[PDB]
Amino acid sequence: LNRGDKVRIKRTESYWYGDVGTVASVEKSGILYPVIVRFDRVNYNGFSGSASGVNTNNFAENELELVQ
Amino acid sequence: DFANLTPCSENPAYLAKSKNFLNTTNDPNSGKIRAERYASALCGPEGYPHLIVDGRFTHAGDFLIPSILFLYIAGWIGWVGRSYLIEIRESKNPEMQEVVINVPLAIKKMLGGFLWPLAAVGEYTSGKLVMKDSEIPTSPR
Amino acid sequence: KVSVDNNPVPTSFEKWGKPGHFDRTLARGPKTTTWIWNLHANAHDFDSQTSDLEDVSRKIFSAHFGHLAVVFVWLSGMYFHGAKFSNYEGWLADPTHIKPSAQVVWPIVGQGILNGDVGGGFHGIQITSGLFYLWRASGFTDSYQLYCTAIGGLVMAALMLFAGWFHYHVKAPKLEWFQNVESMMNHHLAGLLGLGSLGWAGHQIHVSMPINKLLDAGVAPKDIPLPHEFILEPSKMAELYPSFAQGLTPFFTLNWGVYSDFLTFKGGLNPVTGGLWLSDTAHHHLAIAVLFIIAGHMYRTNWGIGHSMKEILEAHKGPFTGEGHKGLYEILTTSWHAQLAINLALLGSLTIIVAQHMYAMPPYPYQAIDYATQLSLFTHHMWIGGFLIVGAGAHGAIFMVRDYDPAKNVNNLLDRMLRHRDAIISHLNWVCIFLGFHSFGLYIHNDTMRALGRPQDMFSDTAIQLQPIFAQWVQHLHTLAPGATAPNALATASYAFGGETIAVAGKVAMMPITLGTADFMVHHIHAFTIHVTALILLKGVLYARSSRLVPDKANLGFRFPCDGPGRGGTCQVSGWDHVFLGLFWMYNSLSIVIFHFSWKMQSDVWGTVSPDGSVTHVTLGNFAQSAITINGWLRDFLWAQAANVINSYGSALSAYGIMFLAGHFVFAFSLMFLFSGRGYWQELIESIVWAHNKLNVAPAIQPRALSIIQGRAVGVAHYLLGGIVTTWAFFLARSLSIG
Amino acid sequence: LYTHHQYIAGFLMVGAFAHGAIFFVRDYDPVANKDNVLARMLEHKEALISHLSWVSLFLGFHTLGLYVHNDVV
Amino acid sequence: GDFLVHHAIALGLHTTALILIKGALDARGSKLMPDKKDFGYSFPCDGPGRGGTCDISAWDAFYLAMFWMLNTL
Amino acid sequence: NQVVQAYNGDPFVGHLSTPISDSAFTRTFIGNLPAYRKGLSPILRGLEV
Amino acid sequence: SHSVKIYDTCIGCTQCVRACPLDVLEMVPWDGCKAAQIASSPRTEDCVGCKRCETACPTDFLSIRVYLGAETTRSMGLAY
Amino acid sequence: LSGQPPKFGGSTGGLLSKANREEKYAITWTSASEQVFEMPTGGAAIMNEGENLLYLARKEQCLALGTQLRTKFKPKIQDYKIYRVYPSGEVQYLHPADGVFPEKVNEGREAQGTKTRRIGQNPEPVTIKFSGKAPYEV
Amino acid sequence: MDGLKSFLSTAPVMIMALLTFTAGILIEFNRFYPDLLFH
Ligand code: CLA
Ligand code: CLA
Ligand code: CLA
Ligand SMILES: CC1=C(C/C=C(\C)CCC[C@H](C)CCC[C@H](C)CCCC(C)C)C(=O)c2ccccc2C1=O
Ligand code: SF4
Ligand code: SF4
Ligand code: SF4
């Protein structure tokens, strides 16, 4: 996986499960979830009445399916 | 068939009501032309015209003609909105254009709805009408 | 004292196309559909878009000007409808047989049936506002004068729009201009209320008194002189009133006794029209004018005389309140929300006082003739007053969470208010429970004893009796007033306390309102519901900052749904949710108030007086024995008097039947938002979103469900809308069916 | 008798679905129930929930529309 | 007159069924709360976070469909 | 001349020393009801209540 | 007492440990993220269940979970 | 528990009988400057010069007080200690349990309450049937 | 002036213009041909 790559989420937990997202970074420091995938769609986050959630999550390498 | 309903021409109750139909418009003959219009319908003992929604073509104007008319001028609304929403999803800010409607594009799409059933069968045979089950986001299952 | 900033904001169209420019959380763009609701809910929260106290004041000033433009547009609409689309030219000739109608309906789908025969050949909706009685009292004679008033109002609305644009965009006043509240109340008392009352006293002396005295004499409106013909030739006014031959030289020398010809403290009601005399009405406005102009020279201003509010407040300290009010002037001059709380409380109580006085002392000619106008006006102003009192509670809570810092006020009245919130809410809980047990429990006891066949055990007037002895004593004092405790009052203040049944045109204008045990029980229900509304709103105001449950409500805000499911569940701890519950309780309280009024006037006041002198009432004295059980309210009031609103189909009153059913629908619909929660609707919207995604029509603006506060707000809005529309239809169809 | 048994029937049907939900929470094993009819109930729940949404909205819009139309005219 | 009330009855049956199966199938979790099996059947809510989560449990779908059952009957 | 102090000189207990709750007459009267009177056996205070 | 569990998806953003009113949570060192810290819940018998920690968590779905359970005096917030 | 109490006039919001039957909480902070703070019980008080000792009935009230001591004062008071005192007499020490506030990593704390999985790999209630446990704690 | 263009193009103004247009054509069709229960 590299920057700018479109990937499909298979987390089974995430709001963007089955949704596509541009990869924003890959981390090499040996962490559990090193790939920062950022989406057009915002999730369910924040207090009630908040106008938006967050469009970013950290996914592992195995969860992503490359579609580009 | 349909012995329970007599046509409103040979009905006592409907004649009793049609002596006193009101005027719905400024025109003073609106009640008379309405009584002449409903005389060809089927009405029960109450004297009010009933509609027949079997699809029998002797009563096709009761339901099937408004059925076709609504389906056309609502598939118009659905297809136009779908085509506009699909179009604005490649403009680098698809969310603001739902707020401020791009009216040249909107009017072009709205006058694109003459040929929606042909566009519908075209997009269904070419696969743009639906999406695959895996390609769409979904809940945990 | 006038210092302004010139052209503080350019007048440009560019911010119009970018919604949400005002709030920094919306200036990014709409990610979800919650952005729309936030765009509307934060549009007038001027105190949260910025925190300068100067620009919010300029925003408030120009918003007031735009609102006055709206009010003048509405008032121009009223006068234009009375000018063109009305039978005012016909009703003025015969205001005892034909009825007002200021709205004709275009016939499109058969709604020309709403153009019912209102009288004189005119066809249209019979109006229930007292606009025609207002214009008869103010001296209108022809439709051209109403047309001129409508055109002048539209011009004044354009002037208010221009003034709002002027005072935001080219010359906006500074903060020190707004904090001159002593000069402000000098001008609002002396110049707004005082000179307004003086100008209206002058109008009533010179227009209302001649036109209405000749119309009482029996002169046709076509033969009525135009109101300036009584000014250009004062000889005509000398023909009518003999005290105008002496001029103003009795006034300036304090020979005021010769003005008793028309400035009289007569009291009572005019027998030929049913309204108040405009003699004591003009005298009343003159006295109010003098008193207000005198009171407008109280507070200190540029000159050394006057009486500064700060020292007045600091002078008032006792042993119980400690440091006293020294701290309150900085509260009300640095916070628009405390000002809005006090002004909303007093405007709501004033609207309720207006409602309670304009039935018992009907100030307009022929207002007490028709019961549609009286019932509609009482009901309308009760609803407006209750809404404004709930707003007072709301902005008390907003002030406590937002504009109240305890650094600048230690041990003053507001601090000591907050230091014993448990005692206040405790004793108000006790009085609410006490009155709810002893006001509704008497109704349940009567209802059970009537069901059990024990009518001697009931709380009737022919049973265990609960007489309102203090209100009966006060009625006795006001009947015995115009001889001893008001010597120069010829008649009683109103006939509601006692006296003679005033019958004009065969219908009862005003007759004494007797208070039996039914009135005792209903008034204690009134006290109970008013106390519970005060409990909810006062609890919101006191507990807005912090409670024992959530000690940090102040920084969670004002509109927050909950703190979470913990501590058992803190589901409605905000002050906003206390407003939300006080809206339901205000609806309950005012609906009981207007049901009490409608039934008491239908059974004990309104009716037809026969020429033999006997009075027969609209529901024939039901209230004495039926208004003590709940079954009597459900059977003799709601079931019996809705026969006029549900049998109204196929007639002119069929719009009220439609509106009756519509109000029921909106009530039942509101229960969807009130009873449900956000979670169900979000996971249902997700399945609908899936159905859109399957065929590529999913929106880019993500459809969130309504938020928790949004769901509660729309539930209470539809609840009050449905209930008020149902009661509006019920009252305005009962009343047009009784005369 | 009619109203009594129809109310009991409504209560029992709502309880049947309540215990369907309690089964899906507690006693449902998605490993043993792999690709059978229950797993495929849960594997397309959005489709049939959206179609119940459509049919209830459709039918409600037009029953209230016909009732309000008859009522207004 | 029986046509419209049968369609109202069908509307009530379909909407009660919609709420009941929306509690039955979403008892294991939707995107608002992907774990509801661990909170159980009748937990109150999940906090004011995630937008607000007031009646998300399957027990609350029982609750709403109880209202709709009473209406339909 | 303050008449509302804190209860018993403790400013953090949830009570005020108001002229009704903690006056001299209230102390001598509430504190001399049978439920609070000193030295009585429970039988006589229950009998008087 | 309620149990506050922190999962592997924590990014050490500290938002939960300062959103908590009762300061049940605290940050401990960790080797599984860039921030080199993970939230822990040591004094979890003081958790009232307010779920302001879940509200402040940015990771999706949730790196911190509150599981409401056996109520006590501390976990019900009773001043009496 | 050293410290003179704040100059507070007393209030009805405060210590009920829970304080003298079970635990009540004391917050102790030291400030150089005398100023005015909002007690979470309702009202406003006077911060004494030097040490203060405020007795409250809930831990949330003590932490809310400490929060407003931290954020609402420009000379931030961060040396505030929250105790839990029992009517039997012994005093516990609660909020700055280690040296530093919980937001900062002390590097000597222990990761408890941490699961070795995400929520997706949480066990499901059908496996743990009649086990006396619940799907988180397995 | 591009601001009035972008304000007349907003969702509420355009939806109210659209609803007013559809209401106008429906009302005019009811004004000319009043009572059409069927074909
Ligand atoms: C034009 C866009 C668009 C189109 C093509 C669809 C199409 C679909 N919707 Mg709908 N829907 C939309 C807008 C759209 N919807 C909006 C705006 C709402 C919010 C109220 C919804 C909410 C909604 C619900 C709640 C459900 C559907 C469902 C459905 C399906 C059945 C048709 C139906 O029930 O209509 C119903 C339509 C409505 C209730 C509202 C329609 C609103 C207007 C009339 C549509 C046009 C919107 C906009 C003005 C177009 C822009 C024009 C352009 C020039 C800018 C179908 C896949 C159903 C489903 O699940 O299918 C299985 C269902 O349950 N929709
Ligand atoms: C003198 C009048 C006065 C003034 C000017 C204010 C001003 C304000 N109030 Mg308000 N308020 C008042 C009266 C007043 N209020 C009354 C009488 C109530 C009691 C109900 C309240 C209750 C109250 C609450 C509870 C809140 C405010 C808030 C606000 C602020 C923002 C309002 C906003 O953005 O709404 C924008 C406008 C709307 C959202 C429109 C609402 C739609 C209405 C309710 C329904 C439709 C009404 C209509 C008659 C029905 C016909 C429509 C349809 C059928 C066709 C602002 C400071 C808010 C605030 O500051 O909190 C931070 C807040 O939350 N107000
Ligand atoms: C008919 C419906 C109903 C009834 C009975 C109540 C009852 C009450 N509400 Mg209310 N409420 C209602 C609907 C109702 N509400 C709704 C729709 C809402 C809108 C959201 C609210 C919102 C609400 C709030 C926000 C508040 C209340 C409060 C109160 C209490 C006021 C105290 C009182 O009246 O004394 C008690 C009187 C009664 C319960 C009615 C008389 C019944 C008889 C006398 C008692 C029965 C006799 C006997 C004991 C039966 C025993 C039989 C044996 C077999 C056991 C009371 C418990 C207020 C409160 O708690 O004040 C302290 C409060 O703050 N209400
Ligand atoms: C139905 C419902 C929803 C779903 C509501 C949604 C999705 C809003 C739908 C609004 C539609 C789009 C209509 C918007 C307003 C209309 C234009 C108003 C028409 C009124 C005219 C007659 C004046 C919630 O989100 C919710 C949240 C919290 C508690 C209860 C509920 C709740 O009951
Ligand atoms: S989210 Fe809803 S149910 Fe949960 S605590 Fe808040 S208001 Fe109550
Ligand atoms: S808020 Fe969530 S992501 Fe941030 S430190 Fe706490 S558990 Fe980790
Ligand atoms: S539930 Fe509340 S008190 Fe408990 S750990 Fe989370 S934020 Fe802290």
Author numbering:
A (entry chain E): 3 to 70
B (entry chain F): 3 to 143
C (entry chain A): 13 to 751
D (entry chain B): 369 to 441
E (entry chain B): 516 to 588
F (entry chain L): 5 to 53
G (entry chain C): 2 to 81
H (entry chain D): 4 to 141
Sentences from the study reporting this entry:
The cyanobacterial PSI is composed of a highly conserved core containing 11 subunits that coordinate 94–96 chlorophylls (Chls) and 22 carotenoids (Cars) per PSI monomer.
Here we produced a chimeric PSI in cyanobacteria, introducing a small loop which adds a single Chl (B33) to the PSI complex of Synechocystis, reconstituting the B31-B32-B33 Chl trimer from T. elongatus in the Synechocystis PSI. We demonstrate that this additional Chl forms a new red state in Synechocystis PSI (named C710), contributed to by the B31-B32-B33 trimer. The closest distances between the Chls rings π systems over the trimer is ~3.7 Å, all of these factors contribute to the stronger electronic coupling between them leading to the red-shifted C710 state. Altogether, we observe no additional structural changes between Red_a and the WT PSI, strongly supporting our claim that the addition of B33 is the underlying cause for all of the observed spectroscopic differences. We can clearly resolve the 96 Chls (in Red_a), 22 Car, and 9 lipid molecules present in both models. We solved the structure of the chimeric complex using single particle Cryo-EM and measured a new type of large-scale heterogeneity in the PSI trimer, suggesting that each individual PSI monomer can occupy a range of positions in the PSI trimer.
